[PDB]
Amino acid sequence: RKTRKESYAIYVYKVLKQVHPDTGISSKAMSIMNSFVNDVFERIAGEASRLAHYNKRSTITSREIQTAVRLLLPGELAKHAVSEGTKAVTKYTSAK
Amino acid sequence: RKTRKESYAIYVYKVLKQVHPDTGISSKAMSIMNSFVNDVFERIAGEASRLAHYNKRSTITSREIQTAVRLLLPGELAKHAVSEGTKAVTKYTSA
Amino acid sequence: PHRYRPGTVALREIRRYQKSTELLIRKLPFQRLVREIAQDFKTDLRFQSSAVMALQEASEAYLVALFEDTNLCAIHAKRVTIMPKDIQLARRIRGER
Amino acid sequence: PHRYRPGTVALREIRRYQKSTELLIRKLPFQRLVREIAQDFKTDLRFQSSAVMALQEASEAYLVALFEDTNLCAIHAKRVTIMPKDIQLARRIRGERA
Amino acid sequence: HPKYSDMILAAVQAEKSRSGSSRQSIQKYIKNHYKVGENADSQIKLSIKRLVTSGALKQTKGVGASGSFRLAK
Amino acid sequence: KVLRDNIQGITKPAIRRLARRGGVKRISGLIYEETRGVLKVFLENVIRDAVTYTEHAKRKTVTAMDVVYALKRQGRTLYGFGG
Amino acid sequence: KVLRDNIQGITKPAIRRLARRGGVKRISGLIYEETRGVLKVFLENVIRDAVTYTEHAKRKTVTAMDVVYALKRQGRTLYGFGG
Amino acid sequence: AKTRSSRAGLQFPVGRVHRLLRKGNYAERVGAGAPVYLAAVLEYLTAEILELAGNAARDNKKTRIIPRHLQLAVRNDEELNKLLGRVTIAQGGVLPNIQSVLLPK
Amino acid sequence: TRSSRAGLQFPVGRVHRLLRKGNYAERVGAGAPVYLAAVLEYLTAEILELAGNAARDNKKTRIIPRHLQLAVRNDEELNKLLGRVTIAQGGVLPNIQSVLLPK
DNA sequence: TACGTAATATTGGCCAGCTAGGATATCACAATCCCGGTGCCGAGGCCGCTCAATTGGTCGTAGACAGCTCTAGCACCGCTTAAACGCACGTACGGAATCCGTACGTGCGTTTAAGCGGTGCTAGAGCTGTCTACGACCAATTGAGCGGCCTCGGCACCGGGATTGTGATATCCTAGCTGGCCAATATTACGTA
DNA sequence: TACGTAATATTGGCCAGCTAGGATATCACAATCCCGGTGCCGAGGCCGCTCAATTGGTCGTAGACAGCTCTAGCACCGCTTAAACGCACGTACGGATTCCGTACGTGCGTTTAAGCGGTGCTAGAGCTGTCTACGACCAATTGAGCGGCCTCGGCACCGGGATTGTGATATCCTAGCTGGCCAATATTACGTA
Asked: Where in the sequence is N6,N6,N6-trimethyllysine found (chain C)?
């Protein structure tokens, strides 16, 4: 038999190919990327959770993720992050 | 007629009257006490939430609070908080 | 007439300020610094007075504890005088930088 | 014979070990230390090999960084040699020591 | 034990160093070669300060009682 | 317009009193400007977060709660002002 | 029975290699035992929390995840083991 | 015994604590023992700090705990000092501690 | 899929699932997973960018963890995001203090 | 005339006295402190209305408890190194010791603006009510993402030459000491006044 | 008989070369390097199944928005006074310098247990499938906890009198240096043989 564990490995690869088509990645390095995404996921999600509670709201909307990103990320990293975020949200709702 | 702002003030005055029946407490002191209680509340609740999530459980039980207290409090303070919590659960369960 | 030796009033001031809890920065200079820094982040901002008291309580607590670490770095270098380099060692180790 | 001045091989070893990433504590002594420390918390316990590997990666990262800070304290005292007081000052400032 | 003036002159003659003897070199010779008190260091320092001003000791390194000196001859 | 010339309201005797409560006996002359830079970096980091919270609440007034939440964000939790 | 005599398995040349990666040129003789105590306290604090996690999972085997969770608890997050 | 505090022998409100645990997104479901345990731990730590701060107050000749008494209390107790090691107690000051080398000889 | 509609490589479905199963709030808006999945993808690409660069500088075709570490610790802002993080098997930056150098 | 002895003078050494410097003890001065008096106001209690907690009943699913599957943790085993260890040797580093210049503490007079408290103005915080867009939830559906399998090129390992850095030696450079050379002075003997 | 002149011997002073201490350039050896070959295993790709994502549909409620209230944030002014400022002055601190001892690093050889590949043995991790004790969700019941209101005892604030610590000044003791006195040695003169 066999047991299923999910990871972001396939998506990290897909993105690696965009930025560096002619380069690959070890399993160890892959496990770090995985840790990194989970960690950053948890950190934004947690901040967004608190923002909602602070404002007495039952919902985590993009606007909470957006503020979360600005409390969390440093300066230049946030600016770009807010862009890609707003961008993808726009493209998504205009493809409904 | 100003908005209801909940507080742990009344309980803090109770405990303080059990433990020092002639002692008072100022505004700021009580604000600190209230922030202490909220702070430790959040820290324990948070660690319990993580324990449940880590074990794929949907429920926060007194067992999660208990382990939360053991990870969070230092040695002796934990010991005493654990026995004072188990004591409360045991009662509650029988009555 | 009378003159105390250097370090005598300094030591007297240590004991004095370690006995009290009152803020040591003058309230209006501090407030004007808070409004200026915030102005450079977003214009036309009001402050609850308690929000400025909270920023001052925290700020002074930060500097007191930082001067503690700074003092140990000075003593570590067989000195009695704190220097910018002791602050910088402190902050580096703390991971502030 | 032949002899390098004291400090030359120290620098060679700094360059060498800041170039590599492999663990610097021998694995089995560390493992036995981990089991010994754990027994004093709960008896009859097994460890995943990866759990010991995680403890060793973390412990060694901690010690390397702590030696960085310790080095800065020593240099702060116009010294080239690290001493227990540098470690104690480091940990004091880190908030580990009181 | 002889006067500190004599013990310093003895320490310089007994150390055939190329640069006479420093304050530290003289200071340790006196401590091992004579029954000298607890206040040896101040008395040596005072004696060198007086022997340089007299011109009994003439200086080869430093400036003052902290340096290296030889006997005049 | 550019705002400037306010940090100096954190004066030499004030920094001295803080140093005293910190147990400092002797203070180099260069410490004062250094402490101003340190406090500005500190106030910048915290007020930035406070305002981020204020912004998100769609307010024009920075609340003590915004600051408290921000201090907590930076691992500098503060008791006695809410929360 | 009382357990002891394993910490000395963290040898002098091992502590030396660690110091070198930390950029240390010269090492006092008293550093080695000091580093043994520090490393003990660190492992204690981490393994204690790790075991608390194993206990709660009703297991007899400490998993890498228990350690990762404990490191994280202690503000020493570690990537590459199941983060 | 109508209240859940009474049933538990607590001064701290088990009901309100159960409310906060639900309205707090900690888990889907909150067990019945959780608020009781938590309200009791909260009570224990509360009493621990009030004890030491009423004591401080009395050493200082005062009927009222002001925040400095809470600070004296917390920072003289090793374990309270550690629980609140990243905490700042408004208006509480510092402990008197002059370094030895700074003392006149 | 919601990833295509958003133009992401990262899975919007999985992120919405995790945000609900994670007890962050009662309700999760429809834009939230998209935004979050996009931030996650962006940071991913930032680190992969800089660590493929490290890999090439080091004459490798394949990213190992040292390349991720070189990447993160030479970048100020990533270094800060991961300042309490430890990258298994990544080592340190070569940095000898000046006074230790022979004159 | 020469030699020996005695006496006188000069030089050196030792002892005693006086002066200067350093250390210790006592007194004074200032700061914090300890004390009731006194007046302002916030802790804390009484009240009564309200909203969050309690009560008892349905209903659904989490998880405990049991039963089975096999993964990974673990144990003893025996060669082959490379790493640990213990030691010889000596240098560069740490620390102790002293010395000098000025930066930083203390105190004073003058200058500046914080704080107070009292007034007058509105932005906007924060709370209510209405209605709907949005997200939870369920049933049905479908392909994205998973493990299992495979294979092959990226990279670890290694042996055989190359480049750079560190350590040591030889050539050229300055200041100090002893000896050498030259000149002076002191003593002697003879001749002249 | 003494003094002067000329001659010889001993002592005195200054200068030069040689020796010791230094830095720069060049030479040799060792360590980190690098390059083309070689095998070895995990990166990475396809494959086909399946479970989590998607679509299409219902229902209810969170919060977007609009309208209204009244809190408290802001501005501004005059007055009191404590705090800030800047300048004078000198102590004690930091840093620059020398300097001495051994605690360090380096580099041998001998001693050891870490590492690896090996087979063998099974605790216990982890997955399924049953079912019931437990918690969500609900309306109806009600009493704990809230704000509003009020008041007086605790304490902040001040002015009078006290205890402890630190600094400065004065006195006493110890050491050092100088001067005086006494003793010993040498030289000269006188007397005797």
From this structure: 19, 42
